[model samples]
Target chain A: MKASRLYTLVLVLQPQRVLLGMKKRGFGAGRWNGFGGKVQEGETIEDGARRELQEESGLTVDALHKVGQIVFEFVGEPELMDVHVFCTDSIQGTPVESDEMRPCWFQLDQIPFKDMWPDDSYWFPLLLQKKKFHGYFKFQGQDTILDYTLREVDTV
Target chain B: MKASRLYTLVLVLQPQRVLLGMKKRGFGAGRWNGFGGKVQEGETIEDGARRELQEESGLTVDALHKVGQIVFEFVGEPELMDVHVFCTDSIQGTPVESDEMRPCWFQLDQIPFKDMWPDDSYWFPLLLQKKKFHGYFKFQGQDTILDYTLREVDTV
Candidate 1:
């Protein structure tokens, strides 16, 4: 069995909308998601998230509140993945695209799920509710979610 | 250039000593460092760090504080690497090794730099000071650090 790696996914939010970077490559095309990336060999996840968010969306965020995490296991490989999710409303700079991403914003009621991964619709609402959560999901492919269990934590 | 990925790293502390997990693979052979892994696709860094620490060390951490962050550019890659560093003293359960890691403890006075990466000794002291920091390190190879800069944030 191989060891799992560290990575971050950030949900950059505004009053009624959230910022999601459009990846120039990979499976989801023309879809919107938060700014984030993988952890380097000796780096931390918050740094990774901050750097990725800045590089991808041209925004510098000062305060980030972490809301939850999820683990996904690949069936064939002995690999177990651990993912971190953070949220922040405080940001600096204007949104712009770098070589790797094209940035965009989506209103709370207007997320284009057909262009996004199917599982996003399941959990994004919880984020808007300001609820903390943890879960594990089994995926058959990039878009097919086999099974998932999510637990919410109350934030005082 | 490809998109930079987000990564997580955790440093577990027990009084004056730090806990390290030796992987069965990767750069460190007999050496020990912090216990952490990567963040998953939809997870946050805190969640990833907590999950990785729990999975690797069999200890549940009670509180984690973000200490600092570092960015390193991997050779032959244009993607920027970002890392988040976290510190926690509160934990539950006894330390034990999983199939992938062997957990060990090291005192502050006796870190084996020759057996570990060269950059650790440079920034770890700032963590000990309880000062938040941002650092950039240029690594020629795993063992050789080419150049670096450390900026400490005033905690007071």
Candidate 2:
């Protein structure tokens, strides 16, 4: 049986832009996406989100609002990736690059959808509109969305 | 870094009583607890709760309400245990013992606290009152709560 693996993703947002990281050397490498990674066992989910954000982008946030949750399933994989997505408008420090990611800010209208995970296009709009949401994405490989579901929620 | 392991716990309740399992072996052996275990990669959290309930108690439910979320931290362990707790008043089938659990019913006022996980005493009342809640429990070992936090919430 495959174990469910918990992870976190954080979006640092400005009124008209969002900060993203170009992953340097692991899963989703070369793709510009939000900062996040696997949550460690001893930390709360929110703490994990913050830990990953600082690790990947060198930015810190005073508060995070959970805005979405999504599950990513891949054919033949033994673990389900359960991700808690958070957004923050109050942050400290400037974006700095790490060995695993290069931080950058993209205008709300200019996000490079073609260079990010295929699933992002489905949920990014809801996020941009500040709507809480939930989603499921099934993948045949890294670049294809074989099946998916996205919905707005009252809370996340 | 420790990997967060997701788990589920389900409580089968009636107006005056609740169903519980006597764990025959494993982490919670000899204790009376709700039915649940690790969530598999291919299923959702609610699905995992249902799957485990059937496996351990020979019971089936048509609906479950998520009433609580908690994190159990052990001092020397490498993994954080994230548990999603659910409740259901609608069920099908008779309670039966499995190799892993012995099923039984108890009056609402007669739950065996001394024989269950220590944290239950703190959250069980909230669950019984139908309050949504969140909690954190730190353990020196499986049987002792060194520090903890519990709070009612608007939603789980």
Can you list each candidate's DockQ?
0.06, 0.39
**Location of the lowest summed lDDT over 10 successive residues in candidate 2 chain A:** A1-10
Which portions of model 1 show Cα errors greater than 4 Å?
A: A27-30, A154-156, B1-156
Q: How much DockQ does model 2 earn?
A: 0.39
The DockQ value obtained for model 1 is 0.06
lDDT of 1 by residue, B48-116 (tens): 878888887898876677787777765666554557788888776789988667888889787666666
- Model 2, range A1-156, lDDT digits (tens) per residue? 434578899999889888989999999999999999988755677899988989888888899889999988898896668889999868899989899999889999998999999999999989899999989898988988888888898867
Please report, in order, the local distance difference test score of every candidate based on alpha carbons: 0.73, 0.88
What's the lDDT for residue B154 in model 1?
A: 47
- Scored against the true structure, residue A75 in model 1 reaches a CA lDDT of 65
Q: What TM-score, over all chains together, does every model reach? A: 0.52, 0.78
